[PDB]
């Protein structure tokens, strides 16, 4: 009912909250403590925290115990992402008590494992799509790929519960195009730099956009979180 869910992002690298300029590595501005950042969002009345291990995502280590400490400090819903590519990483992630995780690279690299874990865990699992035109991209040490529509079809039929959609080339055309291809909720990720952008995304709620992950803007003080919560309904 007109209400866009808002998920403030805490992206973790080398034990810090950082800025990830585009779909890229090493362009990281550091925003200090991830735990303090997440507590700031919660304090400001966030319903969600989108929490990300960039080291696990990029294969330069991990922040698994730090992410676990941030997750434990939250009284709110937590969506966890980043390098979740096998049973042991998935088990640790779900043990945080998080509301859901995002699988991304795993959907491109081990479709059968994603199929299996969707079957086992239901809507604790969402799949991220990083779209360059109609082509999908991942973080593997080997440049993976896939067709957008073939992948949506497979995941649709696998009972996949939710997609997180990123433009890797807001891309409201891309969001609407993904909404056309599925009856499952779509979460927008990236591109929000103004409240204009949020209302633009919220206009797609009836098409099947459920929420928007917001990072850069909140850290750079483009708007307050309270202002964001107002603007999304």
UniProtKB/Swiss-Prot annotation:
<dbReference type="InterPro" id="IPR013785">
    <property type="entry name" value="Aldolase_TIM"/>
</dbReference>
<feature type="active site" description="Proton donor">
    <location>
        <position position="130"/>
    </location>
</feature>
<comment type="subunit">
    <text>Monomer.</text>
</comment>
<keyword id="KW-0368">Histidine biosynthesis</keyword>
<dbReference type="InterPro" id="IPR023016">
    <property type="entry name" value="Isoase_HisA-like_bact"/>
</dbReference>
<dbReference type="GO" id="GO:0004640">
    <property type="term" value="F:phosphoribosylanthranilate isomerase activity"/>
</dbReference>
<dbReference type="Pfam" id="PF00977">
    <property type="entry name" value="His_biosynth"/>
</dbReference>
<dbReference type="GO" id="GO:0003949">
    <property type="term" value="F:1-(5-phosphoribosyl)-5-[(5-phosphoribosylamino)methylideneamino]imidazole-4-carboxamide isomerase activity"/>
</dbReference>
<keyword id="KW-0057">Aromatic amino acid biosynthesis</keyword>
<dbReference type="InterPro" id="IPR006062">
    <property type="entry name" value="His_biosynth"/>
</dbReference>
<comment type="pathway">
    <text>Amino-acid biosynthesis; L-tryptophan biosynthesis; L-tryptophan from chorismate: step 3/5.</text>
</comment>
<dbReference type="InterPro" id="IPR011060">
    <property type="entry name" value="RibuloseP-bd_barrel"/>
</dbReference>
<dbReference type="InterPro" id="IPR044524">
    <property type="entry name" value="Isoase_HisA-like"/>
</dbReference>
<protein>
    <recommendedName>
        <fullName>Phosphoribosyl isomerase A</fullName>
        <ecNumber>5.3.1.16</ecNumber>
        <ecNumber>5.3.1.24</ecNumber>
    </recommendedName>
</protein>
<keyword id="KW-0822">Tryptophan biosynthesis</keyword>
<keyword id="KW-0413">Isomerase</keyword>
<dbReference type="GO" id="GO:0005737">
    <property type="term" value="C:cytoplasm"/>
</dbReference>
<comment type="pathway">
    <text>Amino-acid biosynthesis; L-histidine biosynthesis; L-histidine from 5-phospho-alpha-D-ribose 1-diphosphate: step 4/9.</text>
</comment>
<dbReference type="GO" id="GO:0000105">
    <property type="term" value="P:L-histidine biosynthetic process"/>
</dbReference>
<comment type="function">
    <text>Catalyzes the isomerization of the aminoaldose moiety of ProFAR to the aminoketose of PRFAR in the biosynthesis pathway for histidine and the isomerization of the aminoaldose PRA to the aminoketose CdRP in the biosynthsis pathway for tryptophan.</text>
</comment>
<dbReference type="GO" id="GO:0000162">
    <property type="term" value="P:L-tryptophan biosynthetic process"/>
</dbReference>
<comment type="similarity">
    <text>Belongs to the HisA/HisF family.</text>
</comment>
<keyword id="KW-0963">Cytoplasm</keyword>
<keyword id="KW-0028">Amino-acid biosynthesis</keyword>
<feature type="active site" description="Proton acceptor">
    <location>
        <position position="11"/>
    </location>
</feature>
<dbReference type="InterPro" id="IPR010188">
    <property type="entry name" value="HisA/PriA_Actinobacteria"/>
</dbReference>
